[PDB]
Amino acid sequence: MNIFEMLRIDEGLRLKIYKDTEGYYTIGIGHLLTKSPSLNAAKSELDKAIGRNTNGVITKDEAEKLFNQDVDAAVRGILRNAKLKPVYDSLDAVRRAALINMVFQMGETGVAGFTNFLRMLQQKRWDEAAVNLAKSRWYNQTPNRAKRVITTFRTGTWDAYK
Ligand SMILES: [Cl-]
Ligand SMILES: [Cl-]
Numbered sequence: 342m343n344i345f346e347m348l349r350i351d352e353g354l355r356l357k358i359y360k361d362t363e364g365y366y367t368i369g370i371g372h373l374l375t376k377s378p379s380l381n382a383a384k385s386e387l388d389k390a391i392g393r394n395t396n397g398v399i400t401k402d403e404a405e406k407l408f409n410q411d412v413d414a415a416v417r418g419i420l421r422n423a424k425l426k427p428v429y430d431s432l433d434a435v436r437r438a439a440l441i442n443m444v445f446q447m448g449e450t451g452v453a454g455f456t457n458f459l460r461m462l463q464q465k466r467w468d469e470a471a472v473n474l475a476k477s478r479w480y481n482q483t484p485n486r487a488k489r490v491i492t493t494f495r496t497g498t499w500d501a502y503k
Pocket of ligand 1: 390
């Protein structure tokens with residue numbers, strides 16, 4: 342199990358423009374296209390993204406290309422972020438993957454804001470940090486995914502994903 346496989350479980354795969362859980366235009370494996378309500382604003386973002394007239398539809402390869410880029414960016418986002426990088430540096434491999442997951446879903450800014458949690462992870466206080474994460478709008482909004490990431494942080498195992 343790795344970050345690729347983990348995220349692929351969490352977000353799924355769709356080759357046609359879809360609405361995320363918040364109501365946003367997304368495609369592929371969790372790639373957000375626009376927060377704008379307009380489906381045309383969605384297809385134009387998507388053509389830009391792919392380098393071709395897609396008409397709202399992409400291939401598997403294309404989906405995978407967007408995905409690689411996005412995991413890449415998430416990683417480099419964490420490493421550039423002054424608040425996240427020290428946390429990331431202090432974590433074991435499994436937990437690193439858990440942080441990448443959260444960064445990919447909610448952005449660097451968002452994660453950077455869970456001040457108390459980042460402080461608990463850094464101090465290796467696992468049970469505590471998991472309890473804090475759960476007091477979040479994120480948890481409340483996508484509980485099953487949230488639980489899986491939470492478990493990953495609590496345990497240090499991929500147990501929630503076998
Ligand atoms: Cl893009
Ligand atoms: Cl979920």
